[PDB]
């Protein structure tokens with residue numbers, strides 16, 4: 001049996017909302033350590049890692065590790081029927097059902113939901129703690145705007161250490177944010193260009209953290225990192 | 241006939257309540273009240289509108305009148321005015337509506353719809369609920385994403401549904417919530433039709449689900465100082 | 477040519493005014509002030525924009541520039557325009573630069589394009605001054621009734637399948653009426669076109685006469701005006 005109670009179920013609503021557009025399903029490494037998820041879109045050009053430490057959950061119980069096949073299309077639709085509700089996630093031992101219980105502040109309205117888990121168990125490999133050439137911390141909003149505004153112009157953005165440049169039939173546009181909350185560290189300067197479509201899939205996680213961190217290097221994929229307070233982090237990986 | 245209602249919002253929110261359920265209806269323009277009673281196209285629901293002349297600030301209506309009205313057409317006319325405008329209605333056979341504040345006047349071509357209203361009897365109900373309107377809305381809405389049928393059960397009330405992605409049950413315990421349960425009943429109602437009734441939520445916050453086997457459910461909304469909007473639904 | 481406008485929102489609300497009515501127009505960039513004159517694809521109405529160089533902080537126009545821009549493309553490239561962003565234009569391609577420290581810069585391709593008529597000041601029998609937003613709802617609320625208002629001297633009238641609808645106003649922001657009574661039926665669909673320029677000012681003047689097209693005029697704060705010439709239906 002797996003039982004996690006989250007007083008601010010809003011965390012779960014925003015997280016499911018974040019990855020909903022990128023992947024539809026994933027193996028959840030429901031472990032006593034925490035909830036780790038590793039998954040990839042249908043075009044196999046991006047990877048999403050979600051870390052949810054058991055410390056953040058007010059009550060966490062996981063007798064027996066478990067890899068859940070979650071249809072995140074159904075889960076996010078379920079979690080929408082809840083922003084202050086206390087969400088508890090209960091997974092009975094060897095049931096095809098993941099239970100999601102929504103308890104209001106006032107114990108007046110309680111709603112219980114069941115989802116049909118699937119068979120998706122892929123043994124997640126592990127990335128290394130890598131050293132990136134130039135990394136940038138900026139407001140999540142500005143990164144959303146830069147990705148959104150430059151998307152009406154071109155299908156891809158050109159990032160350089162910082163300048164965001166995208167070109168198209170309408171014209172060309174260069175957006176540069178100098179240091180100030182913005183902080184650039186460029187050990188070795190790198191110029192990599194990324195498809196804007198998938199970046200705007202990552203920008204759906206902007207309600208999780210106020211600051212987004214972009215790790216770029218020529219020998220590794222881009223790493224957009226949104227941090228979940230206490231619980232952990234949400235790492236997006238994209239290839240040039 | 242002439243009726244002046246300062247709180248023109250009441251007239252706006254009413255028409256917006258029924259535009260989706262019924263498209264046309266007869267209006268029993270009576271010296272007592274503006275009673276309307278019509279049924280949907282598919283014959284699975286009935287609305288009854290009571291507008292006491294007491295709520296109308298100036299109410300004339302001498303000779304008794306049965307107006308057939310195209311609510312869709314009237315809804316657009318009534319949604320032209322803002323929630324602050326003062327609304328007056330006049331007739332002799334073309335419904336006239338005037339909106340004060342700049343003053344604007346429109347005229348709606350009435351139609352020929354005179355089906356004789358029938359008498360509904362005050363029935364006893366096994367279970368009767370009084371919840372805050374907002375809860376009833378969300379409860380209906382969220383459950384509709386799951387499936388298209390709510391199973392309202394009653395214990396000294398639970399809304400439940402089962403669908404393709406899963407199954408759900410929402411339980412509410414005793415604004416405020418009251419559950420007079422003479423006999424415990426459980427029924428299944430179509431959520432699409434219920435979500436037409438929730439369009440009358442701006443009228444007031446007290447929604448009352450008078451519910452009982454052997455009779456159709458009656459979702460009642462209460463227009464303040466005037467009358468009430470009763471929504472009847474047939475179990476499946 | 478370089479023209480820096482600090483109240484960048486103006487050019488935002490400007491381009492959004494013409495974006496719908498005119499898809500392509502010629503900006504005759506001039507030393508006194510940028511002027512635009514173009515007509516819709518149905519040739520029933522003309523818009524004339526006047527933005528004087530006095531409003532722009534720095535303004536240098538060392539030529540008779542005739543930029544054929546694509547207003548649809550410019551309303552787009554006028555996105556990422558924070559309302560308080562400061563926007564400057566330069567001089568075949570049009571550059572736009574936005575400054576807040578984010579400092580985005582854009583470049584636009586320009587079409588090659590027709591001349592400009594010399595519209596004269598002309599005598600209007602009935603001129604009406606009303607609150608700008610009130611005009612929009614008058615057109616919008618009446619629009620659900622019919623496809624044409626009948627403006628009289630001031631009452632607006634529409635007639636449709638649902639029924640007739642009349643809205644009236646009296647002298648009193650406020651309302652100001654003027655010489656000879658006129659009643660002209662005007663196309664509604666093109667009247668709501670002009671109402672998209674309401675964010676630029678709080679007063680609209682329905683300068684209206686019988687022997688000439690109606691002139692809905694909006695006064696851009698300080699910098700100039702935005703005139704709309706709509707012909708009556710018959």
Ligand SMILES: COc1cccc(Oc2ccccc2NC(=O)[C@H](CCC(=O)O)NC(=O)c2cccc3ccccc23)c1
Pocket residue numbers: 023024025026027038039040041042044120122123124125
């Ligand atoms: C052994 O070396 C590998 C190499 C690549 C992926 C892999 O698997 C994973 C490991 C860790 C984390 C996530 C995944 N992969 C996944 O989770 C998803 C399963 C469904 C989902 O959860 O979205 N696999 C695919 O998309 C996929 C299917 C088939 C071929 C592919 C080739 C390249 C990229 C992806 C695929 C294992």
Ligand SMILES: COc1cccc(Oc2ccccc2NC(=O)[C@H](CCC(=O)O)NC(=O)c2cccc3ccccc23)c1
Pocket residue numbers: 044045046047125126127221237238239
């Ligand atoms: C799983 O966790 C990881 C961990 C580290 C990297 C990673 O890769 C990616 C990361 C971000 C974006 C895109 C990709 N992935 C890619 O760019 C392409 C897609 C293949 C294709 O173009 O069809 N390669 C593979 O996925 C692949 C093929 C064969 C063998 C492999 C062995 C290990 C890892 C990947 C492969 C996936």
Ligand SMILES: COc1cccc(Oc2ccccc2NC(=O)[C@H](CCC(=O)O)NC(=O)c2cccc3ccccc23)c1
Pocket residue numbers: 127128130218219220221222237238239240
């Ligand atoms: C967290 O994902 C990671 C993390 C770390 C490594 C990594 O990829 C590898 C894995 C094993 C062995 C070698 C490589 N890496 C390489 O072979 C070269 C290094 C340069 C060289 O050829 O010397 N980089 C790439 O292929 C590559 C570049 C950019 C984006 C990419 C996205 C997906 C796959 C590859 C790339 C993927």
Ligand SMILES: COc1cccc(Oc2ccccc2NC(=O)[C@H](CCC(=O)O)NC(=O)c2cccc3ccccc23)c1
Pocket residue numbers: 264265266277278279280281283353355356357358
């Ligand atoms: C004789 O006993 C009855 C029994 C049932 C309904 C009835 O009619 C009404 C009574 C009061 C108020 C309004 C209506 N009638 C209506 O609402 C509309 C027309 C007027 C309107 O749309 O407002 N008729 C129908 O729905 C309808 C048409 C044909 C057969 C039906 C069978 C069952 C249910 C409805 C119909 C009279």
Ligand SMILES: COc1cccc(Oc2ccccc2NC(=O)[C@H](CCC(=O)O)NC(=O)c2cccc3ccccc23)c1
Pocket residue numbers: 279282283284285286358360456472473474
């Ligand atoms: C009008 O005022 C009323 C008054 C009382 C009941 C009523 O009925 C309903 C109320 C709410 C929801 C749905 C229905 N209606 C129904 O349940 C079904 C229609 C379902 C179907 O045909 O699939 N029957 C009839 O309405 C009907 C058929 C024949 C003769 C009748 C004589 C009197 C009353 C009704 C009928 C309508």
Ligand SMILES: COc1cccc(Oc2ccccc2NC(=O)[C@H](CCC(=O)O)NC(=O)c2cccc3ccccc23)c1
Pocket residue numbers: 360361363453454455456457472473474475
């Ligand atoms: C305001 O709507 C009403 C109100 C009150 C009665 C009523 O219906 C009747 C009218 C005259 C005589 C008998 C009945 N009642 C009945 O026939 C039986 C009771 C037992 C019996 O008499 O055989 N109830 C039902 O059919 C029925 C159940 C559920 C929902 C329904 C919705 C529409 C129509 C019927 C039902 C309709």
Ligand SMILES: [Cl-]
Pocket residue numbers: 022023024025040041042
């Ligand atoms: Cl997928």
Ligand SMILES: [Cl-]
Pocket residue numbers: 232233
């Ligand atoms: Cl972390």
Ligand SMILES: [Cl-]
Pocket residue numbers: 261262263264279280281
């Ligand atoms: Cl109908």
Ligand SMILES: [Cl-]
Pocket residue numbers: 467468
């Ligand atoms: Cl009552």
Ligand SMILES: [Cl-]
Pocket residue numbers: 498499500515516517
């Ligand atoms: Cl054109």
Ligand SMILES: [Cl-]
Pocket residue numbers: 700701
């Ligand atoms: Cl002027």
